[PDB]
Paper text:
Residues 297–391 (using the numbering of the longest human brain tau isoform) constitute the proteolytically stable core of paired helical filaments (PHFs) from the brains of individuals with Alzheimer’s disease. Here we use time-resolved cryogenic electron microscopy to study the in vitro assembly of recombinant truncated tau (amino acid residues 297–391) into paired helical filaments of Alzheimer’s disease or into filaments of chronic traumatic encephalopathy. At later time points, the first intermediate amyloid disappears and we observe many different intermediate amyloid filaments, with structures that depend on the reaction conditions. At the end of both assembly reactions, most intermediate amyloids disappear and filaments with the same ordered cores as those from human brains remain.
The use of sodium chloride instead of magnesium chloride leads to the formation of filaments with ordered cores that are identical to those extracted from the brains of individuals with chronic traumatic encephalopathy (CTE). Most intermediates that formed in the CTE reactions comprised two identical protofilaments; some filaments made of either one protofilament or three protofilaments were also present. As for the intermediates in the PHF reaction, the 332PGGG335 and 364PGGG367 motifs and possibly a tighter packing in the C-shaped protofilaments appeared to play a central role in the maturation of J-shaped to C-shaped protofilaments. This extra density was previously interpreted as sodium chloride ion pairs.
Author numbering:
A (entry chain C), B (entry chain A), C (entry chain E): 306 to 378
């Protein structure tokens, strides 16, 4: 038995952008009010209140190549 | 048995953009109000209130190539 | 037995754009109010209130090429 696993990759993933800007992300400009009375809890509580984990992601590229090679015998 | 696994790739994934911008994302500009009275929780509680996990994602390319090669004998 | 697995790819996935912009996303501009009185929860609880998980995705390309090569003997 002979196996010759010989894939050839000459690909490209490319971008050109002339200018990139004037990006505004303003999450949670509005008021938040939370009121609690006579609450009972008897197992774990997780609470997040306000502006949390908001992302502004502005790469000049952001291009991806994902390549997977597998052989099983 | 002979196997010659010889795929060849000269592909391109390409973008050209002249300008990218004037992007406005404003989650949660409105008021949020939560009032809780006499509530009873006998198991785990998770709570999120306000403006959370919002994304502005503005890549100058954002092009993707996904390429899987598999052999099983 | 001989197998010669030799696919050849010279394909292009291409985009050209003059300008990309003036994009406005304003989720949750309206008021949210949540009164809650005498509720019993004998069970796990998850709650989300306000403006969550909103996305403004604005790639200058955003082109995709997905490619799978498979051989089973």
């Amino acid at each position: 038995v002979q196996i010759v696993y010989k894939p050839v990759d000459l690909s490209k993933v490319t971008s050109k952008c002339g200018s990139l800007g004037n990006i505004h992300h303003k999450p949670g400009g509005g008021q938040v009010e939370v009121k609690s009375e006579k609450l009972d809890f008897k197992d774990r509580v997780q609470s997040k209140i306000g502006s949390l984990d908001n992302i502004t992601h502005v790469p000049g590229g952001g291009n991806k190549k994902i390549e997977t090679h597998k052989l099983t015998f």
